[PDB]
Amino acid sequence: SLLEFGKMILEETGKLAIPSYSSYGCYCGWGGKGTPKDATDRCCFVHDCCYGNLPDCNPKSDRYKYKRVNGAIVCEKGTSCENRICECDKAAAICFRQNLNTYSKKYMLYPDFLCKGELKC
Ligand SMILES: COc1ccc(C(=O)O)cc1
Where is the active site? Predict the structure, then answer.
């Protein structure tokens, strides 16, 4: 679910999903179009594609379970949709951590009109 993803993001990065990643660039918190602005935005682009791989799943509301082994995220077994959702979120959270070094506040509340064009998954 979105709230669980938000908790995962905070755990991983120390940033609040809202407002750090809810309106960032072209794809974070509300993707759609344009060339991703930076590596963080690309995390959200891939995350969006990842959810797009699951048309018959409901990633916003469906809850999954995960644990930490060391600091590593381990998705626990639930339904097929839950497992696949968890893997998408895990990847994104790790991606955000990997790219904290280039996270830029200037991409927060990024205006829609600067995001144009379709980019294929
Ligand atoms: C509503 O909260 C969020 C938080 C993060 C993201 C994201 O990282 O894409 C989307 C919505």
Answer: 47
Query: What whole-number distance in Å separates Cα of residue 6 and Cα of residue 54?
Result: 19
Residue whose CA is at the smallest distance from ligand 1 atom 10: 29
* Pairwise CA distance, residues 44 & 29, whole Å: 8
Query: What are the catalytic residues?
Result: 47
The residue segments making up the domain with residue 54 are 1-121
What is the CA(24)–ligand 1 centre distance, in A? 9
Q: How far is CA 39 from CA 9, 15, 24, in A?
A: 16, 16, 11
Place of tokens 């294929």: 120
How was this structure obtained?
A: X-ray
- Of 10, 32, 34, 33, nearest to 21 (Cα)? 10
Indicate the number of domains in the chain. 1
- Output the domain CATH number for residue 73: 1.20.90.10
Q: Which ligand 1 atom sits closest to the C-alpha of 31?
A: 9
